[PDB]
Each structure stands twice: as C-alpha cells, then as structure tokens.
Design a protein around this ligand. Sequence first.
Ligand SMILES: *[C@H]1O[C@H](CO[C@@H]2O[C@@H](C)[C@@H](O)[C@@H](O)[C@@H]2O)[C@@H](O[C@H]2O[C@H](CO)[C@@H](O[C@H]3O[C@H](CO[C@@H]4O[C@H](CO)[C@@H](O)[C@H](O)[C@@H]4O)[C@@H](O)[C@H](O[C@H]4O[C@H](CO)[C@@H](O)[C@H](O)[C@@H]4O)[C@@H]3O)[C@H](O)[C@H]2NC(C)=O)[C@H](O)[C@H]1NC(C)=O
Ligand SMILES: CC(C)CCC[C@@H](C)[C@H]1CC[C@H]2[C@@H]3CC=C4C[C@@H](O)CC[C@]4(C)[C@H]3CC[C@]12C
Lengths: 439, 52
Amino acid sequence: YEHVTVIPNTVGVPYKTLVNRPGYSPMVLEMELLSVTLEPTLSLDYITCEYKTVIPSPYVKCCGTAECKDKNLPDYSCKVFTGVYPFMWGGAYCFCDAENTQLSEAHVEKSESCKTEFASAYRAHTASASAKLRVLYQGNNITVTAYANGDHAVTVKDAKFIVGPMSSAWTPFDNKIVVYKGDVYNMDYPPFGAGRPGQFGDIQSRTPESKDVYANTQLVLQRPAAGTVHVPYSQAPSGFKYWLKERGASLQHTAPFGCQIATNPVRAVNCAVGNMPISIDIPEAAFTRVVDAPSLTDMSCEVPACTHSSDFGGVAVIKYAASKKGKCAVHSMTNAVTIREAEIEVEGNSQLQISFSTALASAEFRVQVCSTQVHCAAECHPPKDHIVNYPASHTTLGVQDISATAMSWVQKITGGVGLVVAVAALILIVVLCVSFSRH
Amino acid sequence: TVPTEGLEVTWGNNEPYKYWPQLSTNGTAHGHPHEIILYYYELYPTMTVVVV
Ligand SMILES: *[C@H]1O[C@H](CO[C@@H]2O[C@@H](C)[C@@H](O)[C@@H](O)[C@@H]2O)[C@@H](O[C@H]2O[C@H](CO)[C@@H](O[C@H]3O[C@H](CO[C@@H]4O[C@H](CO)[C@@H](O)[C@H](O)[C@@H]4O)[C@@H](O)[C@H](O[C@H]4O[C@H](CO)[C@@H](O)[C@H](O)[C@@H]4O)[C@@H]3O)[C@H](O)[C@H]2NC(C)=O)[C@H](O)[C@H]1NC(C)=O
Ligand SMILES: CC(C)CCC[C@@H](C)[C@H]1CC[C@H]2[C@@H]3CC=C4C[C@@H](O)CC[C@]4(C)[C@H]3CC[C@]12C
C-alpha cells in the first residue's frame, strides 16, 4: 500500500496520519521530527591569519656605502641611510665618523600560529538535507535516520519510508561565509589579491599549507634615530586581530527562523521553513481484515471540558459497544482538533477517554474510531496563563471559524439589513413596472 | 515583547530560553456581543478591526 503525507518542518511537534485500505482495519501512524539538518557544500577561496614582521639585523658599513637588491618576498622593502654614527655599549661602533651608511630591511610572512588560529573564507552553493525521524508503527516507536534528498529509503519493521524532498531552500548561510573556530559569520570577504590594509584580508593565503602569501600591510621603513642601531618601521596593525575584537554576532545568535548553526562540518540544525513530504509503503501482510478486527457500534460523545490552550486542553468521553477485545485506532477528521491518543483498547460496553487540544472557540469535531464516526461538540473557555515555554500543538486558526454565538449574531444583523434592502427593492420593481404599463 | 511565533532569549553562557504566547483574553466567548468583540479583538488586534 502506497501512502503519502506531508509534515511541517517544525521540530519537536508530532503530526499524525491515517492509512485508508478498504476491507481492512484503519491504520494510524504518528511521526515526529527530532532534528533537521541542512549541510552546504563549501569551497575554500583563502585563509585569513595574523602576520609577523621579520626584521633581520641591520648591516652597518662605515667609511663606505652599502647596497641592497629587490627580493620576491610577499611584502618587502630595503633602504640605505647615510650619515649614521651608531654606538655600542663600550663605545662608538667603529673608528670612522664620516661617510657611514646603514642598510635596513624588513618583510612580512605568515606567523607559526596560522596552523591553530585562522579564519577561512568559503564560497557556498547548495546544501544536502537530512533528518532524524521518530515513527510510531503499530505500537512500537522506532527511530530512523535518512537523507531528505529523496534518495534514501529506510527500513522500519518491513516498511519503507522515503523522506523528502524539502519544499523550500531558504538556507541561513549566505553566498559567502567566513568561519572562525566555532561560528559561521556571513560577510563579504575581500576578493583574493585585493585586501586593503588593516581590515580582514591583510594577509591572505590560498591553502593552509601553501607558500603563496599576498600581503599589503604598508610597511615603510623609517630613519634610524641618531646614536642607536634600531631599525624603525611603521605598519598597520594586523587585520585578523582587529576583526577578532570587533566581530559582531555570529550567525548562530542572529539567524532568522530559529536556526542553530554548528561547525565541523558547517551545518544548520532545526530550521523551521516549509513542509517535508513523507511517503510510506506498507507491506500487505501488516494490514488486518475488518472481520478479524474489533468493530464498534452505538457511539455517542459528550465533552466534559474544553480549554483552548497550546497543551492538550480537553477531555472527551465516548461511549462504545464492542464485539471483541482488541486494539483500535483513533483519528480526527477535522484539521483543527488534534487527538493525542493514537490507539486505545476497547472491550464490552464502556467509556473510552481521548484528549484533544484545539484552538477553535466552539468545537465541532468528528472523531472516528475503528470505522465508525461519532460527532462531538462543545464550548471552550480561554486559558489564563499568558506565556508558556512549550511549542504550540494545535494547528492554526482561520477566519472561517468564528464561535457559534458569534455566528448567530452576524447572521441576524446581515439578514436584517438584507431584508430591508429587499423590501425596498420590491417596492421599486413594482412602481417602475406599473409606470411602464401606465401610459 | 513576545511575537506570536515565539521568542528566544540567551542570558550569558546559559542555555537559551524559549517563550510562546497563549490565546489568553479578558473578554469572553458565547456571551454578549460587547463581550465577544473584546474576546476576538484582544486575540487578533488587527484583523478583528479590519473585518468589523
Ligand atoms: C515511545 O516514546 C514516546 C515519546 O518519546 C519520548 O520522547 C522521545 C524523543 C524519546 O526521548 C523517548 O524515550 C521519550 O519517551 C513515549 O510516550 C511518552 O510521552 C511523554 C512525553 O511526551 C512521556 O513523558 C511524560 O510522563 C511523565 C510521567 O512519568 C515521569 O517522567 C518524568 C520525566 O518526564 C520522570 O522524571 C518521572 O520519574 C516519571 O517517570 C509525565 O509526568 C510528564 O509530564 C510532566 O513532565 C514534564 C517534564 O517532562 C514536567 O514539565 C511536568 O511535570 C509535566 O506535567 C510527561 O507527560 C511519557 O513517558 C510517555 N507518555 C505516555 C505513556 O503517553 C512512549 O514511551 C513511547 N510511545 C508510546 C506512545 O507508547
Ligand atoms: C456580534 C456582533 C457585534 C458582530 C461580532 C463580529 C465578530 C463575531 C466577528 C467579526 C470579526 C471576526 C474576526 C475577524 C478576524 C479574525 C482573525 C482570524 O485569524 C480568526 C477569525 C477572526 C478572529 C474573526 C472572528 C469573529 C469576528 C470577531
């Protein structure tokens, strides 16, 4: 038997479905999503890290001129200064006090820390879906894990479930993501080769182990102060360090739709958008023939109490007359009312009790147990605790449903206006037609 | 302020709290017309007004 149903992506909320196979006792399954995961495919563009400035000892040449040549280091310069007369702790550096020159040089390279502390800039494209599903099958609750692409089918007690494919593809992760040790931040990385000094991107390298580093850190060497050998430099501070302090908030705390974003691998958990279709194939053997199953007759319904609250609000007592002792199945036939209990046990002549949670002010719900339908009606009074800490379990309400005593007043008022219009219209019709007959 | 879809609050390093509103009201249903309008007005502050 092929059965198809659709369940909302809200996690932690059970939804139920009815399998109708004529000639056999009805089967009711309960399914709940325990987790939903969206896992994006990422492609690394470059890694941002802290840089270190390397300044080798200066070369001091007195009574002569030093010279330097260009190097192919990521960010490098050299300059020769003249008129230098440096001192050591024990006296002047050398005999000569004239025609002295000094060569200073510096370059930028990735620090050793870039193997532990770094931010990776990735491109995002598409994502694969998967989910953890708990299905109640004939009174056993089995947990199944499946991809939601529409390509995985899982086996539960000889039944086939093919989850998926998800209705909408809103993904919290944007087009470009920068991921630090633990959180994913949506940002626009500067493109490779173009980092401006002092922001994210001052030093960028293609792969963690790669040796090509492009750095634009503005190193400009400056004149040694007289009387000393220091090689003074001026540079913008490290880009990564500044981003770390002024990060802002990661996607985990600021995503829309209640998502939780976790890393290694980058993934999004529990996003509440859309409906995931579930298709179930049930082998013929499981279904049970009508004659074998308990059949119920003479059913009446009285609702002792109704409260429209998110938790299961009201109790309904239904009186049954039954052929034999066996398990039986309960399912609401109206969307608004949802019945918590899937299966109840029936024997002899007695009263069964089912708990219903609803958002409808006056409730008219048909409840069907074992192939017979009994109609239950009630008035519900509102709940008095304003904010609760659990997700709503009743389904939403629409303008079609207004309370009963409400409808009556609308009908009467609209009707009264209508009659007045009609009486007036008839008077016009009569006068106008008589005038036409008159000449 | 609590949205109808629910609010998530994070305090320091503690696990996040989640809150949802219930359909509470100081009005009544199945009563007098002036009590019924209040019931629906408070629960649906925009539409009740537009429909009426
Ligand atoms: C298969 O699982 C059904 C649901 O599965 C549950 O969640 C899954 C994700 C998985 O973790 C699984 O292991 C879990 O069992 C399960 O049906 C049940 O559904 C109820 C939850 O919806 C579950 O819990 C309740 O029962 C207690 C009474 O028992 C107590 O449980 C406490 C912990 O919650 C213990 O500390 C106590 O010692 C005691 O054992 C109720 O009192 C609970 O309500 C109260 O508890 C909450 C916190 O949980 C408090 O805020 C309030 O006090 C609140 O009033 C809660 O309703 C039940 O175990 C069970 N209910 C039934 C039998 O209908 C089944 O095991 C199975 N499927 C079925 C339907 O057979
Ligand atoms: C009795 C006289 C005064 C007329 C009363 C009109 C009342 C009963 C009608 C008019 C406006 C109607 C509401 C208009 C909009 C909504 C929002 C919708 O999401 C649920 C239905 C609901 C809440 C309707 C409920 C019933 C309603 C309040």
